[PDB]
Structures are given as structure tokens and as C-alpha cells.
Amino acid sequence: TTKEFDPNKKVSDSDFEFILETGRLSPSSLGLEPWKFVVVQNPEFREKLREYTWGAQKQLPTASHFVLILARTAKDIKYNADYIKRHLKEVKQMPQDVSEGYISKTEEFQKNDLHLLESDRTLFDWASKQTYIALGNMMTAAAQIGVDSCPIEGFQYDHIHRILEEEGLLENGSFDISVMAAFGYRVRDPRPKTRSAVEDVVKWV
Amino acid sequence: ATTKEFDPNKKVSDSDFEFILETGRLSPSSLGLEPWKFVVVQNPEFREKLREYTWGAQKQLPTASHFVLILARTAKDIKYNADYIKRHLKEVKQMPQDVSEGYISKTEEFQKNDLHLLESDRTLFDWASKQTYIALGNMMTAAAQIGVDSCPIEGFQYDHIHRILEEEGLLENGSFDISVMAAFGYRVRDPRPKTRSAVEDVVKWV
């Protein structure tokens, strides 16, 4: 938990590549990797975002690196989307017949196991969940090399969506904003962590 | 790091598993609400009841050293005006009554207007569930740091799993619902190497 960074201490290229790499190598439901990591270093772009990111008033100006994590939309991660076909063939190297079975399974999973086809937002939120795995792993990776981080949800979706859309970063409706993340070196010690009593959040069966 | 099957005769030590569980509990959450519960299911009978409707853990449930159900808080507890939040801010975060009133107002504006979380009970639940996926990742990474393999599991029939957890009393009068499951143990063999999109396809710099 850091809210503010040292604006003059930058995470090295190769430390940041390690953070991004732990994101890329994160697991995802069905191996679909329904994410994109947009690293926003451009000062002016940060300032546009900051106007609608109440939760990053200090983080955006000071962060060494700032990441928008995008999740795939229903357009791309519904069972029968082309993104999934390309993904299974080109990344997972799945034969055509193996991929047909995999897609069938994906279909049954989405429709009847988790009821993801209720709405386009339900599918989006499923893909977004996968991005929170990457988020956690990227923050943990950072911490392991002495790099502080802050997850950021405090933004006005409508504005952020507009800004990213105009910028072309959502790739004709393939993506939407999932969550943001600032990385850098803290300028002060964090609030000491408070957490629920162990017996309130753990039960053994 | 992708394991579908474990050694049923190699158990994670209580101490090693506590390290895993603790990194989960210490995970960050939006607004610090920690909207989760970790149910560790070691009872082989209970595993078998889950297994009947958990297609995605046919081999994991029998063989895992440890099996975890991660629950998320429902609309009942993490809607801005819910009592869970007041108790949480007061008793865990030690917020003065005046500070907590402001925090709740902010939570309300955040949920209604910033992220549109009150579109349905399911959208609000899915927000809390996303917090649980942070913990899930952290638990998996912690495991890997100490040589422990892990498998996340979404491959289950919601309706059946919900019913089973509900009947067992684990959802605490609608306070929780199933978010995601996780198996922990020692692999029976090395996994294939990971395939992933090339870095230039999933990273973009502005």
C-alpha cells in the first residue's frame, strides 16, 4: 500500500520488464489471457487520465510506471469469438479438431456452469477477474524486487472509457478498462496493515 | 506453474500452507473491505460432494494437499450502506464514526456513479469477486515461492456448488457466495512449458 512515489526514482527498464512479464505469464481461466497492459509514461496522457481518476491524484504525477489493465469484451471472449479461435491456434498451437472440442467446452462452461452469457457486462467482468490475477502477481513481483505499487479503481468509468476509446486503445471494442496500477518507490512508510481476524476470514472444513 | 494433478501422498506442511493462506488474507482489496472468506476443505467427504459438480477439478480435488474455496461478499454485505461495512470500518480499520460516515458516502458515489456497480446484485458481487482474484494470484505466487504447485478452478456448476455450500452453512445467511476455487499440492511430474501471447501483443506503451 503506497499512495505516493518518488518522482525522481525510476524503476529500471529490466525490473519493469520483469513485472510486465509476470503479468503476461499469469494464469487465466481457459488460458485465454483476456488482457492487455498499457503502460502510460506520457506525462500529458497521465494528466488527461488524472482529471477523472480521483483515486490517483498523487500516484499519476509521481509513479515511475503507470499501467492500465484492459480486459477483453464479450466481442472477443464469448465462446464463439474469432479472438478465441486465433488464440487457440496461434498461441496454444491447438489442432483444428482439438480447438472445436475446446470451444464446445468453453460454450457449456459459459452458458451453463457460470451463466456468463446473462449480459455482455457479465462476460466482461469474468475476463476482468482474470486481470485481477495478473494485477496481484504484478504487485507481488514488484514487492519482491523492492518496488512499491498501488492498485487503482477510483476513476469515472464513463470518462476513462471515452478517453481510451478516442485514443484507439480499446481496438474497435475488443477491450475495456479493467483496473489501473501505479509502480514506483515510496517516499514514506505505508500505513501499517490492518486486516480481519483470522477466524473471520478463514474456516476449515 | 500449470498443474492439473498432485501427489496424493505429499502434503504441504501446516506451516507452509499458513504462509500461503496468510498472503491471501494480507492481500489488498478495493476500499480495504477484504470482501472474502477462505474455506479450506480438507474433509475428503466434502471434497467428494464438491467433485460431483466440479468438472474442472476431477483429479485436483482427490489429490490436492489443500483445497480452498474462495468466497466473496454479496450485495447484502458490501453494498455501500450495508452493516458489514460499518462494522468493518469501525472494528478493523479503527475509523472514527465521523470518518466512517464520510467513507460510506464516498463508497456510495463510487459504486453508483464511478464504476456502475449497482447495475445489479451480480455486478456488485462481481466487483467483490475481482478482489478475491487478487488474493488468488497472491496465494498462487506465495505457493510457488516455496516450491508448492497450485491450480485455480472455475470449472464448476454454480447452481449445485451454491446449494451445497448453502446447505453446509458456509455462506452465512447470504453474506457470501462462491467466487473461485484453488488446489494446492506437489505436482506428479513437470508441466509442459507455458504458452502465452508474445509480449508485443499484450503490452503497449503510451
Author numbering:
A (entry chain B): 17 to 221
B (entry chain A): 16 to 221
Which passages does the manuscript contain on this structure?
By using a flavin transferase and carving a flavinylation motif in target proteins, we demonstrate that “dissociable” flavoproteins can be turned into covalent flavoproteins. Specifically, four different flavin mononucleotide-containing proteins were engineered to undergo covalent flavinylation: a light-oxygen-voltage domain protein, a mini singlet oxygen generator, a nitroreductase, and an old yellow enzyme-type ene reductase. The crystal structures of the designed covalent flavoproteins confirmed the designed threonyl-phosphate linkage. The elucidated crystal structures confirm that the covalent attachment does not significantly perturb the binding and microenvironment of the redox active part of the flavin cofactor.
We recently discovered a novel BtNR that is capable of reducing a variety of nitro compounds. Inspection of the crystal structure of BtNR revealed three potential sites for flavinylation: three neighboring residues that are positioned close to the FMN phosphate (R15, H16, and A17). The dimeric BtNR-F3 structure was determined to be 2.0 Å. Rms deviation with the structure of BtNR wt is 0.5 Å. The mutated residues from BtNR wt 11AYNFRHA17 to BtNR-F3 11DGLSGAT17 represent the flavin fix site. Intriguingly, for the first 15 residues of both chains, including Asp11, no electron density was observed, and these residues are probably flexible. The FMN phosphate group shifts 1.6 Å toward OG1 of Thr17, to which it is covalently attached. Despite the Cα atom of Thr17 shifting by 2.7 Å compared to that of wt Ala17, the covalent bond is formed. The phosphate group in BtNR wt is stabilized by the side chains of Arg15, Lys209, and Arg211 and the backbone nitrogen of Ala17. In BtNR-F3, besides the covalent linkage to Thr17, the interaction with R211 remains.
